[PDB]
Design a protein around this ligand. Structure first.
Ligand SMILES: Nc1[nH]c(=O)nc2c1ncn2[C@H]1C[C@H](O)[C@@H](COP(=O)(O)O)O1
Ligand SMILES: [Mn+2]
Ligand SMILES: [Mn+2]
Ligand SMILES: [Mn+2]
Length: 156
């Protein structure tokens, strides 16, 4: 039994492209990823996801839809990362570089998997297919998966 900390992950997914952010600092720096961060006290998970999207990309959206949940375990870290994954296709501003993230659009036949977290190669395809998923990944460091589980679900 480990304890877990709540995080969000937000993918702006349109019919032919996806918005990713190049992490400029901190955890996972140098990788393209969705936008997000720790959920704060007093906010719902969805509202934390909306806040992090605004802070890191400049985009303000009224609503997100939950598409997945992924638990990350790191060797040597007793605390699990409980990551709630959200999507939307509906935006109405331009992405803006923040201190944390540089946003960039990618065509959906140019998803930059080699420069994303290794786990994304497994669950991102389900997201593209509009399937919901539960995942778990145990990492040695930032590059090596020692164990993982991925399942399509009907309810996240
Ligand atoms: N293995 C992984 N794969 C992934 O796609 N995103 C991850 C991840 N591990 C952490 N993240 C995301 C979850 C959060 O959005 C962010 C971590 O929080 P901050 O470093 O505070 O932004 O990175
Ligand atoms: Mn953040
Ligand atoms: Mn934060
Ligand atoms: Mn963040």
């Amino acid at each position: 039994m480990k304890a877990s900390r709540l995080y969000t992950l937000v993918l702006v997914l349109q019919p032919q492209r996806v918005l990713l952010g190049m992490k400029k600092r901190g955890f996972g720096a140098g990788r393209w990823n969705g936008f997000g961060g720790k959920v704060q006290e007093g906010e719902t998970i969805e509202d934390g996801a909306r806040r992090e999207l605004q802070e890191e990309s400049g985009l303000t959206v009224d609503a997100l839809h939950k598409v997945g949940q992924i638990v990350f375990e790191f060797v040597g870290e007793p605390e699990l990362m409980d990551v709630h994954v959200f999507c939307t296709d509906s935006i109405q501003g331009t992405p803006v570089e923040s201190d944390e993230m540089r946003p960039c659009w990618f065509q959906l036949d140019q998803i930059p998997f080699k420069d994303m977290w290794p786990d994304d190669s497994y669950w991102f395809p389900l997201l593209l297919q509009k399937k919901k998923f539960h995942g778990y990944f145990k990492f040695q460091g930032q590059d090596t998966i020692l164990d993982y589980t991925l399942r399509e679900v009907d309810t996240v």
